[PDB]
Design a protein around this ligand. Structure first.
Ligand code: 0G6
Ligand SMILES: *[C@@H]1O[C@H](CO)[C@@H](O[C@@H]2O[C@H](CO)[C@@H](O)[C@H](O)[C@H]2NC(C)=O)[C@H](O)[C@H]1NC(C)=O
Ligand code: NA
Ligand code: ZN
Ligand code: ZN
Lengths: 248, 140
């Protein structure tokens, strides 16, 4: 996260961190949507242009209080993956279209003050909240190129497809959307390669619930003027999520 | 001449992608595997190894090319219409076919009915530092 503020405790109880076993290495952010199902970007597990092809038994997940590092009692809970599900037409050769993966936990996790799942949006919620200018939130580790001690939170407005389109030479699709600040909005901010930002979330004013509308997917550098982070359009991919889960 | 509905009506025999790759059979193991969790239009006939657009992909007709995820390619037809670029919150299809629950507790597990309400905030009527900024931006 670049140009963010200090996260509070259990501000993001859904935030799930993904680590490579050998060596202990942070890969990506993710979100908990039930006691056993974890939503993330396909590009975190699979990207052959970089020779990245991770599997169940190479990966670790950490959940809960990120250990307020006053070296006093650690409770970041550690879970293992039964199954990974990469979207079958994740267009990794072209523009990363359908940048979405599911991960089943080996053992279902118990909910606490620090571990609670995020909602997946319905038709009316998505129609209501997916507007240019409406702000969502990403939480990750701050960028000074790796991770600082305290979680950073950044609020970014959704951008008009026309400005998204005119801002990059990559073919953008209905399965993506871009968020962030235009030059001379004043406010800046972005996610970055490695901060494990994971979910882009929004708070429904109709029922006070946090919904995941996006997944950190791709960008061209970090926090640039006339550039915007791209987010997997979760809602438009919901039928896939339902079909993997309901047919498990 | 030109081809409507980004290939949704196409019945031709074009069996090679735009990278010059040969289409695999719709009916092959590696293709049936990659199709399990996708939502195809039944109207669209998955014949032989012909580039179809079963899932209404607005890029157009395609076909499996190998068996691992991402192993598909598009095919060069002469579309009249570059698909109208809908905005982020437009054209959002319906998901119900019926807070309300969407998933099946057997496979999904518990937590859906309770999702998105944080125990250290929304359960205890405590605003967080920044959530003001979000709710401010949702008015216009
Ligand atoms: C998985 C994450 O580390 C990362 C998210 C980056 C978000 N960046 C900003 N500014 N919000 N993903 C990536 O780095 C993706 C995955 C593979 C390459 N990539 C990129 O963002 C490239 N920089 C650009 C790109 C390459 C291929 C296809 C599309 C975009
Ligand atoms: C990612 O990981 C594994 C490598 O261990 C690959 O899976 C195997 O692929 C071979 C053929 O190349 C098959 O004979 C095996 O049955 C496969 N096993 C499984 C578990 O899939 C996989 O193909 C790799 N993916 C990519 C994109 O390279
Ligand atoms: Na910007
Ligand atoms: Zn290509
Ligand atoms: Zn469209």
């Amino acid at each position: 996260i670049v140009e963010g503020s200090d996260a509070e405790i259990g501000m993001s109880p859904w935030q799930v961190m993904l680590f490579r076993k050998s060596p202990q290495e942070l890969l990506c952010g993710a979100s908990l949507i039930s006691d056993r199902w974890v939503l993330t970007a396909a590009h975190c597990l699979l990207y052959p242009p970089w020779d990245k092809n991770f599997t169940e038994n190479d990966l670790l997940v950490r959940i809960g209080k990120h250990s307020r590092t006053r070296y006093e009692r650690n409770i970041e809970k550690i879970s293992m993956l039964e199954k990974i599900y990469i979207h079958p037409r994740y267009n990794w050769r072209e523009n990363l279209d359908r940048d979405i993966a599911l991960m089943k936990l080996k053992k279902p996790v118990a909910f606490s003050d620090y571990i609670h799942p995020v909602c997946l949006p319905d038709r009316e919620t998505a129609a209501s909240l997916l507007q240019a200018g409406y702000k969502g939130r990403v939480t990750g580790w701050g960028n000074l190129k790796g991770q600082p001690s305290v979680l950073q939170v950044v609020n970014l407005p959704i951008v008009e497809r026309p400005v998204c389109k005119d801002s990059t030479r990559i073919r953008i699709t209905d399965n993506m959307f871009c968020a962030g600040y235009k030059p001379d909005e004043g406010k800046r901010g972005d996610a970055c390669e490695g901060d494990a930002g994971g979910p882009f979330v929004m708070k429904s004013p109709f029922n006070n619930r946090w919904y995941q509308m996006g997944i950190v997917s791709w960008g061209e550098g970090c926090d640039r003027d006339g550039k915007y982070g791209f987010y997997t359009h979760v809602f438009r991919l919901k039928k896939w999520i339902q079909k993997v889960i309901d047919q498990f | 001449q030109c081809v409507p509905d980004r290939g949704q009506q196409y019945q031709g025999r074009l069996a090679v992608t735009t990278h010059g790759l040969p289409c695999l059979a719709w009916a092959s193991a590696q293709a049936k595997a990659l199709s399990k969790h996708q939502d195809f239009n039944s109207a669209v006939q998955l014949v032989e190894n012909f580039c179809r657009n079963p899932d209404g992909d607005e890029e157009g007709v395609w076909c499996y090319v190998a068996g691992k995820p991402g192993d598909f390619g598009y095919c060069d037809l002469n579309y009249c219409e570059e698909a109208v670029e809908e905005e982020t919150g437009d054209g959002l299809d319906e998901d119900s076919d019926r807070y309300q629950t969407f998933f099946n507790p057997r496979t999904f597990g518990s937590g859906e009915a309770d999702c998105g309400l944080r125990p250290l905030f929304e359960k205890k009527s405590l605003e967080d530092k920044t959530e003001r900024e979000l709710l401010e931006s949702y008015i216009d």
